[PDB]
Design a protein around this ligand. Structure first.
Ligand SMILES: *[C@@H]1O[C@H](CO)[C@@H](O[C@@H]2O[C@H](CO)[C@@H](O[C@@H]3O[C@H](CO[C@H]4O[C@H](CO)[C@@H](O)[C@H](O)[C@@H]4O)[C@@H](O)[C@H](O)[C@@H]3O)[C@H](O)[C@H]2NC(C)=O)[C@H](O)[C@H]1NC(C)=O
Ligand SMILES: *[C@@H]1O[C@H](CO)[C@@H](O[C@@H]2O[C@H](CO)[C@@H](O[C@@H]3O[C@H](CO)[C@@H](O)[C@H](O)[C@@H]3O)[C@H](O)[C@H]2NC(C)=O)[C@H](O)[C@H]1NC(C)=O
Ligand SMILES: *[C@@H]1O[C@H](CO)[C@@H](O)[C@H](O)[C@H]1NC(C)=O
Ligand SMILES: *[C@@H]1O[C@H](CO)[C@@H](O)[C@H](O)[C@H]1NC(C)=O
Ligand code: NA
Ligand code: NA
Lengths: 383, 392
């Protein structure tokens, strides 16, 4: 058995939408990671002889957590052996009323401002900022659609609206975000429009941060654009410098700015992020009164992908065989091996094959996994 | 006979309104009586600035009340220091942070909070960061004008409503009825003394749980840090929502390991819903805390790094010593407080390249006689101690 079509880790769908997922498996000829293959629940799903496992659209009192939120798997088997797919996490989510808000921001004139689209934490996984717009409907910008980093206004990849060098005119404007539910097509304007409240500098203020926390963390994807916020106010208007700690030490290096890594006012943007961009960053903000610093721990995740070589061999008893698991991704918390669908007793890319009997023949699988996703590779040993 | 020593050091921090002005004392003794010199942030000695800065014969530094137009950063926002010297030597006081604040209006706001039914909710009083260290929450007020948090200096933790020591309004076990209410916070400026209600009113927007939801925190950040002072009541928020309603357990990491111990709740250490309150904090309460939140569907965890400060203080052992030429002299800097970022040394007002608590002069020469000082500093604060070396 082998699949060139395998289900995705995350399956998310509405109560109205429903979903389909197919596992194709090939060879010359579902289950649960809870260990069992269970049949069909009436009207909450079905298996068809066409291999699709289908969750139909359902009224939400018919929501059952043990069906609708669970890990599923796909087992393909034949004469010679069997193999398991990667973990498939099904999440059904009932279409529900939600609102987003833009709260006011309070800034000292001359400083950069950051407007935020406030979204309920419990819908925040399926609801993302599309655009920001004026009182009269004119756009400050549309997220993710092309760019520029030098403008008065910038809609950050993370969805916040960034405003360079605030001035009285900026306080005459209202700011309203448009948001999109990614399970449905639904777009909605925020229930409220935010305003900038600008304080005229009188005396001098050392840099102050929006909160008292000196550390935060954030997660990011490879090939995407990651934003590190540094939110600081001061008069005279401070300058911001970003640094990155050498992994494993307490010392630092200036972040090198170029056409990839960009600084907008105080904010750092890492474009086309790579796993190597992970680390602890230090934002340092200074003016003639004083200075302050804040740390951000960045993790850049990479998709888990695994393939085994040598994939297909012929070995009799007394001789060697070998399988190395070749895998890419970030992070990697665990590495597990599985023989014909049965988890074995050692975790390592290097496994020990010495004296074979044909009890040891089947199809072999190498599993790579982290908190979010898993990746699987299937090999074969013929005798 | 004797080198200078401070009878009264100026305090670490002087914050004052332009309408108040301020006075700062520096009094040092000695035989002969010492001369007093004040110095500013850049190290230069300072005299009178008519209308703005004055020093009297007793060494007192005075800032008269002044008009906003007359504000000067090189005068009014500064780290000063008192220097006392006689023929025997010089000592420098601890840092004196002088900050004048020109009276200026500000707004506080209460934003809405979105919560799943049955979960706890936390309403925050949003105070702009640039006024934030002058402005404290006093009470909360609802739409009918009822006051929350205005009685006692400690609040009962077993009620529906709790105003937390850090100023937020905590509400247990929200239900749809709690959505018909709106609240304002009342803030007080600790210099001007003015109090005002927040310019906006917040309310709980309550979502009726339909399906199941794993725990989700208000922020995607898995780590934050917090400062608090010894003997105060420190609050560690864990703001997470789930359906079914989740359980929350607090842990503390074991210093120098991967592992963690459960937090012990007692009369001093309280848990209100998901929120941990450490009363009468001590330095030992410092560390990395973990909040873990679970329900049927899933679980999540978030870290909080807590530092419990204690005031810095120092003395040198011995306060005085007499040493023959050629012989070793030793000074030991004894200090307390928390945290301690740096220990540094001084001799007669000049900085020495010694970072360690014991300072040993292997063989003393004539020029070694004079005053010695160790300084202990962290980000917020400093302390100093002085000692005298005499020759045999
Ligand atoms: C410390 O700095 C403060 C600056 O904020 C000083 O307070 C200011 O004092 C000046 C006088 O030098 C006042 O200016 C006058 O204002 C009135 C109108 O007053 C009304 O309007 C203002 C707001 O516009 C309001 O603050 C007042 O309460 C009144 O409602 C004019 O008619 C005068 O011609 C003159 O311009 C400021 O009003 C006042 N500001 C504040 C915020 O109180 C304070 O005097 C300084 N302390 C000193 C010098 O010891
Ligand atoms: C499951 O998904 C459906 C969509 O297929 C959700 O639809 C909701 O349906 C209810 C009524 O069936 C709508 O409420 C209102 O009903 C009154 C009459 O009682 C009517 O006058 C209103 O115009 C409105 O139709 C509700 O607006 C609608 N919402 C959405 C987002 O579709 C349904 O809510 C989901 N299940 C649950 C338990 O919510
Ligand atoms: C900026 O402020 C930091 C404090 O966070 C300080 O360590 C640094 O030396 C300051 N830089 C300058 C140039 O003053
Ligand atoms: C609670 O959630 C944490 C977060 O990962 C998890 O490690 C732990 O196993 C969960 N506890 C239970 C009993 O499910
Ligand atoms: Na001191
Ligand atoms: Na002293």
């Amino acid at each position: 058995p082998v699949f060139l079509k395998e289900p995705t880790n995350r399956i998310d769908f509405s109560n109205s939408t429903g979903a389909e997922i197919e596992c194709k498996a090939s060879g010359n000829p579902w289950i649960r990671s809870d260990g069992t293959a269970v049949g069909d629940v009436p009207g909450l799903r079905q298996i068809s002889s066409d291999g699709k496992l289908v969750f139909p659209p359902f009224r939400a009192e018919d929501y059952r957590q043990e069906v609708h939120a669970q890990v599923y798997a796909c087992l393909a088997r034949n004469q010679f052996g069997s193999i398991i797919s990667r973990d498939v996490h099904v999440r059904a989510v009932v279409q529900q009323f939600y609102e987003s808000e833009v709260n006011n921001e309070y800034v000292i004139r001359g400083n950069a401002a950051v407007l935020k689209c406030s979204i309920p934490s419990f819908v925040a996984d399926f609801v993302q900022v599309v655009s920001w717009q004026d009182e009269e409907g004119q756009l400050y910008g549309s997220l993710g659609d092309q760019q520029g980093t030098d403008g008065k206004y910038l809609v950050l990849p993370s969805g916040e609206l960034h405003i360079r060098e605030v001035g009285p005119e900026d306080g005459y404007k209202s700011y309203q975000c448009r948001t999109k539910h990614r399970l449905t097509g639904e777009t909605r304007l925020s229930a409220t429009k935010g305003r900038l409240v600008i304080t005229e500098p009188v005396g001098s203020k050392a840099p102050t941060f929006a909160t008292a926390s000196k550390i935060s963390s954030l997660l990011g994807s490879s090939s995407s654009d990651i934003v590190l916020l540094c939110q600081a106010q001061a008069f005279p208007v401070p300058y911001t410098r970003w640094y990155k700690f050498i992994e494993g030490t307490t010392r630092k290096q200036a972040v090198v700015l170029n056409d990839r890594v960009k600084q907008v006012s105080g904010t750092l943007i890492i474009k086309d992020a790579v796993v190597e961009d992970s680390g602890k960053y230090l934002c340092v903000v200074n003016n003639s009164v004083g200075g302050e610093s804040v740390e951000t721990v960045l993790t850049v995740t990479a998709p888990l992908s695994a393939k085994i070589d040598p994939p297909t061999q012929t070995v009799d008893f007394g001789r060697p065989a070998v399988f190395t698991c070749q895998y890419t991704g970030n992070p990697i918390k665990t590495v597990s091996w599985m023989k014909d669908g049965k988890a074995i007793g050692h975790s390592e890319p290097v496994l020990r094959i010495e004296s074979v009997k044909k009890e040891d023949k089947g199809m072999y699988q190498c599993f790579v996994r982290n908190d979010q996703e898993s990746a699987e590779a299937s090999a074969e040993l013929k005798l």
